[PDB]
Structure 1
Amino acid sequence: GYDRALSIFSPDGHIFQVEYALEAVKRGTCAVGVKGKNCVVLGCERRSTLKLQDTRITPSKVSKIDSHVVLSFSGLNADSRILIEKARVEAQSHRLTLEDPVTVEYLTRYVAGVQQRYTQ
């Protein structure tokens, strides 16, 4: 197929396409997380450009990856769905092979690896 390189190095040492990817995150709605003593809370802001929405069916920003792990994001909404799907798949696969749900660190390492792969 088409595998022409789009993400390459700048004279001063940055990968421009990754740097511009961070720009897309900057203009995405805000998301926050803080951890209590015995809990974690996830908060997200919904935009005000359009307000005739149906909240019943509009994909909300916090997603269950498994029954014990959650994921929120900021950036391209369509882009996030590819990550959430793969993470869900990986989580079932890990229950299948290691007979245990994933640790949060494991799931993170996994998503991060997918992101890294798409930079090279």
Structure 2
Amino acid sequence: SYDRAITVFSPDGHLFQVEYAQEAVKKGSTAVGVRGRDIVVLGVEKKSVAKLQDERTVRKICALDDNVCMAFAGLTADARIVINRARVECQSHRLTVEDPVTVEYITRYIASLKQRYTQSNGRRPFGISALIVGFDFDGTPRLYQTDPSGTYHAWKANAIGRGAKSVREFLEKNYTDEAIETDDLTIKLVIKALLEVVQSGGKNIELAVMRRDQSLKILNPEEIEKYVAEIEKEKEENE
């Protein structure tokens, strides 16, 4: 067994291999998530596909359960194993306590799995950040994030990946109460932010909503073509 402390302290009180892992998050593709009162809206930007090749194998929005969606950024190799370990714990939770897994419970399993993994021997920490979005029992939509050090943290809106603070500064001046009035109105709140990011000219964007009773539903590039037609049309007549 390879027994060696990888993550040790600094002479000023920091962790080098943790703050090196946060740089690897900062060059993954941008994922943006907001929440409404009945429908949640989340969608990655910068799909960057070769546009003559396969696309159903490159998806970065999956399902942990029927009520839990999960997007991420960072390096995708360490990401699809955290998902597969999360799909087991939420499935073994049902063999215990009978309810479906609340969105708060599955974030604590991922964050605790990531903290003890910055503690053990011979292990570099994970280089991913994630957004866990779900609608639990009694219909309360909420989301969370997860730092590579393992600090789960709720929000009303979020944006991670490369070009995040450029969106995160844009969202707070853009998040109003009346922006979450309708379902398709909140989708245009996402579409303006990703257009204020890396290019996202309609073919590089991919959104997916959840109406608190359905599974995750990806709209094909016809509604995003329709929404970016009418979000740009409202900007062309206002200015």
TM category, shorter:
over 0.9
Q: Which of 1 and 2 has higher RCO (CA within 8 Å, sep 6+)?
A: 2
Query: What residue identity is the alignment partner of 2:46?
Result: R
For structure 1, the 5+ residue unaligned runs are none
Letter matched to residue 99 of structure 2: D
Q: CA deviation at 1:32?
A: 0.9
Larger Rg: 2
Task: Tell me, yes or no, if structure 1 residue 34 matches structure 2 residue 34.
Answer: yes
**How far apart are the structure 2 equivalents of 1:119 and 1:24?**
16
The aligned counterpart of 2:82 is: 83
The normalised TM-score by structure 2 is: 0.48
Letter matched to residue 20 of structure 1: Y
CA distance in 2, matches of 1:46, 1:24: 16
Displacement of 1:53: 2.8
Structure 2 matches for 1:1-120, cutoff 5 A? 1-48=1-48, 50-56=50-56, 58-120=57-119
Residue 109 of structure 1 aligns to a residue whose secondary structure is: helix
Alignment partners' CA distance in 1, 2:112 and 2:31: 22
- Structure 2 distance, partners of 1:64, 1:49, is 22
Q: Which secondary structure state, in structure 2, belongs to the residue aligned with residue 43 of structure 1?
A: strand
More strand by share: 2
The amino acid across from 2:101 in the alignment is: V
- Once the two structures are TM-superposed, the CA of residue 37 in structure 1 deviates from its matched residue by 1.2
Query: What SS does the corresponding residue of 1:34 show, helix, strand or coil?
Result: strand
Shift of residue 47 of structure 1? 4.2
| TM-score where L is the length of structure 1 | 0.92
**RMSD across aligned C-alpha pairs, in angstroms?**
1.4
Identity of aligned residues (%): 64
- Shifted more, 41-50 versus 97-106: the winner is 41-50
Deviations 1:97-116 (CA, angstroms, capped at 9, x unpaired): 11111110000011111111
Q: CA deviation at 1:4?
A: 0.8
